[PDB]
Amino acid sequence: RLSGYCGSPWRVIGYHVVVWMMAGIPLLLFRWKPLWGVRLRLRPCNLAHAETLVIEIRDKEDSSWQLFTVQVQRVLRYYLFQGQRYIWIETQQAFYQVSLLDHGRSCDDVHRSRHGLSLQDQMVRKAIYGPNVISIPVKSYPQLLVDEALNPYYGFQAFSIALWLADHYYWYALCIFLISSISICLSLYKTRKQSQTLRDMVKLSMRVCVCRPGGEEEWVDSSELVPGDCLVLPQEGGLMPCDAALVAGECMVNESSLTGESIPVLKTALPEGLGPYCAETHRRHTLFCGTLILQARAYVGPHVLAVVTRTGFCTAKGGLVSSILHPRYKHSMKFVAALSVLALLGTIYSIFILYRNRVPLNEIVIRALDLVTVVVPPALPAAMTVCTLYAQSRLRRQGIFCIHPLRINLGGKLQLVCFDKTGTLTEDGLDVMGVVPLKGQAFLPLVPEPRRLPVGPLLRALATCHALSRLQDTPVGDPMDLKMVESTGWVLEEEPQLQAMEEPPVPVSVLHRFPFSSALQRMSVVVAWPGATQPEAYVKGSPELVAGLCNPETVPTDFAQMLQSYTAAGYRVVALASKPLPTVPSLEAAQQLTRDTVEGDLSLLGLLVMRNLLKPQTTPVIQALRRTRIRAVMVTGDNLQTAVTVARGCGMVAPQEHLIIVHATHPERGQPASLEFRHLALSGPTFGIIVKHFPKLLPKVLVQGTVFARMAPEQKTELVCELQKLQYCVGMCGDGANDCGALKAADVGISLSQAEASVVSPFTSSMASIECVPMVIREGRCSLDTSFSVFKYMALYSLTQFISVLILYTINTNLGDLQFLAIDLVITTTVAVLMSRTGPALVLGRVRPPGALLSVPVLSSLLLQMVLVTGVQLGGYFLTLAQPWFVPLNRTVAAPDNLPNYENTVVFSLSSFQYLILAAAVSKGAPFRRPLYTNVPFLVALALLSSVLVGLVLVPGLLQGPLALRNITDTGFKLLLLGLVTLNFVGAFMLESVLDQCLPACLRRLRPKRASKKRFKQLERELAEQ
Template sequence: MGGAAPEVRAGGPPGHHTRVQSGDIYMDIYGYRTTAMRNFVFYALSFCTLGIFRLLLHWKEEWYISMRAEKCTLEEATIVYIIDENHTIVYRSVQIIQQKAGGRPLILPDGKGDYKEVPRIRFFTFRKMVYAWFEEDGKFMPPSSLDSTAPVKVFIDRMDDSAGLTTEKVDQRRITYGKNIIEVKLKPIVVLLFKEAITPFYIFQVLSVSLWYWDEYLYYASVIVVISVGSLALDVYQTRAQEKKLRSMVHSTGEITVLRDGGKLVTFDSSEVVPGDIIVIPKLGGVMHCDAILMTGTVIVNESMLTGESVPVTKVAMTGIDEDNTTGDVRFDFEKHSKHILFCGTQVLQTRFYGGHHVRAMVIRTAFSTTKGQLVRSIMYPKPVDIEFNRDLLRFVGFLCCIASVGFAYTLGMMIHYHAAWKKTLIRSLDLITCVVPPALPAAMSVGIINANGRLRKKDIYCISPSVINTCGAINACCFDKTGTLTEDGLDFQTLRPVHPPSNSRKRAEFGEETAALVPSKMPNNAEIIKAIAACHSLTRIEGVLQGDPLDLIVFNQTHWTLDEGNQSAEEETSQFDQVQPTVVRPPQNDRDFYGADEFAVVRQFTFSSALQRMSVIVGSPNAVSQHEMTIYCKGSPEMILSLCDPATVPADYLDHVNKYAQHGYRLISVASRRLDLNFAQAQKVPRQDVEADLELLGLVVMENRVKPVTKGVIRQLNSARIRTVMVTGDNLLTAMSVARECGIIRSDRKAYLLEHRPDSKTPDGRTVLTVKENVSADPDDFVDLSDGAENEVEKMLTSNYQLSVAGGTFAVITREYPEILDDLMAVCDVFARMAPEQKQYLVNYLQTLEYTVSMCGDGANDCAALKAAHAGISLSDAEASIAAPFTSKVADIRCVPTVIREGRAALVTSFGVFKYMANYSIAQFTSVMLMYYRLTNLTDFQFLYIDLFLATFIALFFGNTGACDYLARIPPPTKLLSIASVVSVVGQMAIYAAAQFFIYVWVTRQPWFFMNILQEDYSDADLRSHQGTATWCLSLFQYIVLAFLYSKAAPYRQTILNNKMLCFAIALTTAVSLYITLWPAGWVISFLEYDPIPYFEDRLFVVVVSAACCGVSYLFNKIVIEYLILFRLEKWRKIRKLRDPTSTIPKWERIILRIGKDVSWLGKYAEIEGIAEKPKTNGFHPKFSTGKVRKSELVDQIDEFTPL
């Protein structure tokens, strides 16, 4: 769901176009070839126009490809024209590597796990990836995409490879794949400067400065050069700083040990490895420099560099019999087989190995094709942001140029009327155009983002992509992971609910009493559930400290068992376990007689999988009587374990108890077991699906996942600001709904419905049956709504009376079988449970297609894809910067979300304000110059300098220092620069300034002390000073100052201007200096500024009074016309009118809500809508969690829960 696919370009011969796609990432490739005639015309026009023609083609790459080349097949192409999923257009030259005479043949992967010899390799490089031409497929593809998705059998066949690659094969593969290095090369400063300098704005500045130097405006032109160079330097500095920061984060090489040439162990730099190499994983760990498949042993890694999750993860070797039914022709899949993959960038903490052998892994991807490399590429080439803002910016500049063209025509006419020399006529006419685009605009436009980024860093929120900050100001949908994000990362053990197995007195299993104390003698079934809890986990000792998943740690500590991974030599310790080093768990000394053994060994572990929703271990006792006494213990989600259990071992009221606990916010783990008739060798090879079946249910482990203290306050803030909040979690649906109600994602004034599916029921057209039922909630009369008071008409029209919740399984069914309801579902469903990582990413992308601006906040576990996909991903991590998301918060709760939105709104409003200030100041100056041209006078060089440098630039520099408002307003800031309010504001202020300047100009001409300047016959002399120019200039000084006040917008997005001490100082200083220049100028000031002062103080005071009146009118116009009549009244009326008109151009999600109505009845066409569920009887069960609404008696206590950063 990377956005709507661009239309395929029409025309061209067969084979002219292909599409390369990976998930929702794709690019269209078109073939072109250069011709001698086109090249001649291209170079001739470029030479004759002194490079101007080439510059135009640089700005418009579609024209470049049409001018340089003609359409052809991709097989013949010398240039490829690329359009990616973000509609970015680039072209790349096709290069060729030819086999040398007598040299080794070149190779390419054949997609079947082997390589084919080719005489040459045609390829191009796009965003650090090499795309080679595969003739049989008729398309360009990355070679790594073929050999890393070969059939699983190919990799299994190499598991016993102890010889490694030969030197000849390594040399061949290095030509194909290049060196294994993720390198962010620093572009030369000259290149960065040149690329920035040839943008349209800076080219305009070069032409302007050239014109001013030609006109001998030396001081002003020199200052403009300094400002432009400074702005260029700032841009280049920021680019270089980001490059250095990214390079320091990702650049990593080191020594690596590889099997080569028949099994020789060779140690060299990691940049030399190639796909297919067999590497040795050191026992004491290190950093992975490539993606590799684990061949032997097990490895414990920390993947926080990629995921933000610091919990150790266990990787296991790929066995001869795959555990997930992926034998035969099934291809290797990085997501499905991630438990076997050591990813580049991860930290190896510990290895467990076969006796006398090394832990080995086979390199599968290198450099930028690795998982880490892909993350780095997504940072280096992010999705374009602020496209609409940039487009509006160019349109607004075009609007200003239209105004300037009127001045150009006026000046040209005046100069011709006065018979001015042609040179002066040309200079003055062009000079007026240069007044329109202010020279300090690039630097001024970035001050809001720079200051917002600095304020975020002070609050421990780090941003590696500052351009995203403006986008955050438009966020209207926030997605949250649950565990570790909305709720505490750790869980509290609440209770254990064991199951009594069937017996002579009962035909079916029954639940026992709840117990918080795990006493073996009081447990049924020989306390098998305690043994299962003690053995079934992924905990490990690292440097003597027990580490692993927090849930596993908490539950294991309740058993009081101990875990030992052994410290003896491998041969001594593993002699009883077929040379495999096991994890051993031991019961407390007093309980060992009860269990009949001193210790139990975890012979094999089936690691947890998000897709499978479970993990298992095979356990045996070293001193067991029979070598075939094995037990599998399995734990996972209640739904999954239920599907694997023998029905006779499951209590009849199992689902009732599960629902009861889940509805009150508890996290549940079901535990089951099964006796196995296997020896140790068989246990190492048995397929997972063969032993995870016909299990006996042992009971439920109930954990309490508390909501973080700040969560409710943050969600309340977002709800009050009309920002949609969505929970996206891998947890149980009912648990997720309960937590969503408690924290406010499911609103207390709305009904909550579950959308489910019946896997065994089909509709007449063969689709899976969907059902909708209302979730149990408390009595509405006992609660109050936490949202703001009365909603206005717009809010009422866009507010539904219900919220939907759906689980990942049902979501997959809808995506596959009911795609026609996806739009409607996404607009009203706010809780997504049991979501796999790829489903989270799909959800975020889909919300964007509904025209939401989406943020995603997660702790990194399974959230990386969604964090990357969102407009603004916020990772809760310990690291200062994570490459998983643009934003990283060191404070591990969601208070960072409203902070980022508030700062984004402040930066966005600042950008708008700065631009309108600079545009208005330019137009005000333009008006002054036009009045001067009426008598062929002008402002002096230093008068221009005072305005542009001391007033405009000095004030604009401190515009962004105003901090963000302390709260989130209900109405978001405008996101369109080219809006009615902006245009009316600019045109209206221009009219006010023009009227005031014209009045003072006429007033001066009627004063008794006024002397008309004498015009030269051909107007060839320098511009003459005049009292008219002085009065107009002095008046305009105060207009520039009041503009800063008008456009330094405060609440509801920024603090008041008084909080910006530097801006207040700048305004006060410039006002004082301007008053001094106008009223009491000293002789040296008059001489320096080169103007004729107004002779009498009373008349100078009159100019100040007129200035004050003009400023007052400007202020009233801004308050009454712009803010009240347009932004409040007109916009509200237009919004209501659009909502009532189904054909209007409102966001897609708004159109959906208006269409489907305020209740859930629209789903009746696709699903069975059940009646309102009754409240279940608790039977003495009193959970600690409430249902999520706030009782009236508790409301006061919760008001002050949240304290903003």
């Protein structure tokens, strides 16, 4: 990602203001290519040292952004671009981001001193790094009102209002203005809600203290953190201002709003060692933003000291917020082109008819302008943007809590869902099943049974090698750690904070404890006890990792079968190693905090066999997702056999399963295809070594691959990117923190076991089940179907209104004043506002919704529907003209003063029901949405409208004076018109429920072949090599 920056300070006075004062009219039409405006308006020639208005050149992205270099102080010229600050350097003589003294600099030799930020001239660090606060720009009511009238739609509406006011019409203009004001207030309410859901999510202000060198303490506001500072963390509480680094002491934070887990993580102080310092590998030495310190009193002295790393919008939480709250079709163009073509043809026909009627030109332009300016139904942007709001409002009452609806339509076109293993498909609580010793009788099994029989170092290695921590009620931590501690018989009591109780043979004390990270799957600990000449060091982790990190003679040639037999049953077994820890290493390592040499000559002691059970609400959702031709793979980090037996516990798709056999270390890395005892399974290193050597077999294994075990936290993002590169819609459903970065690089992200709409992912659920992905998919498909139906209904309404105007303008006839208002408000707006009902059903569908709005079936449906409408219209016209009626008085009183007549009455009476008929004929679906008899408010509204409509075609005693209607004593109000409107109402349904069959599909299916999404031919070519 590269881009240039060129600008100029200012231009000389003169015509540079007149040019933009005169060329301001075509600004509404010059929205395309915005570089021309900034190039012709203000673009003088100057040097390259005093830029004030800088514009960027398009190199990789077609966009444009305007900036302003503010100067508060040297020069100190800087601007705000997407929240990131850019300063002007003197050495490189170019713009530089805020990345100095980091990512390759600020070594430990100058970072492990922390003099204390002596009282110098603090005027250069506040204007460069900015204030230590996350201020969200908010807008007031006039500020939000002045910038919303920039769209050309509002200008067209204002022009229509002016044209209606300049024609002695104060009724239609009033309703149009009311609808526009309703749309404006709805948009302002939506913007206010979208701003309030973010302003309340960020942290608030507090009162903290900043330490100074010596005996100086001040109570300043909670904004003083600058890169390279040192603050104090009293009260043993959380509420972290921004990112920081703990250099002295240990602490435990709660990264629940940054990772997605409520498990306490232990933070270790930064040790010595001259090397690079970056925020990519020291995940246990720094403190991120939004962390809650559980219990950390002091380690050396009165209290611990923390070092500030970064402040502003580039922190861990602020950067993620700015990156995930960043603002990111072709058939619509042809649709509006055809609509404009039909409109111009109709207006040409109308002007030809008017010229044939021998009418002077003074009355032709006023009608032509009105006809060309009235083509779009009111509340167009208010009806297409309210469906997402209604969906977001109705999803809150089910469990899904989204931060902002942006990718709702993407859920309806999903084809691959990734599921986790622990926390998603299985229960989080484990169960112990005994200890399998490996040191008894010269590396021999002792028939392990589930009991509590510790001999020798088994008590300390099982009761001390952990990361337990109590908060006034009980030790809380990892579930496996709790299950191991409770199955031992030891109680942790309050270094005095790491002591135990009930020690039969000898009391024990924990000197040092190393936490667990995502990079390495192990954890060391220092275990000492009075009565020995040297302590011991234990470590717990995966057997495959500790097998090549110990003595070559620790287990005979029986582990490859024992581990497989223990993992092929559904249990979870781990390995525990031990180190003799002689006097010299224990003395020279307890004062340096080393890790490369402490994990050397290890010795296995025993194995902990756990038990993981699946959730009883997993098989129905899995079957429902499998019976809808939707691929579902499992991406975990456990052993291969564990994932295999977990997948076999349900058995979705596994014909002739194949696995990659271990002990494959060929120089050419040639992995063959073996048998288990169509689909393949990939491991961590197995998938890692097939992406660099041979870059030609990746799309062949990724399709059939459904079991991804032993994965790495840094490899899941690469897999997601490789899956998305093939034009897919893969979505991961993770629970732990090992797959946090993969959710930020996918289309959809599940946030199970979260709350308050965590920022870790836009979609967030409030239940521990997998029944949220199908719900999201069906909600998205229902929203897409509703939007398509609304667009089709709007197009049909526009076309039928054009046809009505055309048939009304045959010689000289105009509709009523209040009739247009009653049609656009009661008949059109009321049914369009309440059209977002009838959500998704409880049964999914195998057929996928279409992604285009200009298909052959829908176009043929619209064409046949309009043919039927014009046919029934001409039939009604012939019927009302073939009756013994009176004679008109045209060509002598032609003026807007003879509104009550028999010309437009029957036309309006026949056209008013057309909208109500077409509204209930396009918004319906059996497998996508709910039937029409489910929503009660819309049903009673339609009933009230139908009653009001039928109340006028019989006994015309009222609602005729102000409405400009007349009375008739003929059979017009009788079945003569009722039998016709009912016939049309039935014919519309009969014609709409016939083309929805698979006839057009099978007619347009046998003609073409598989190309342009030739996925079928791709699968055929893939299977052709078998």
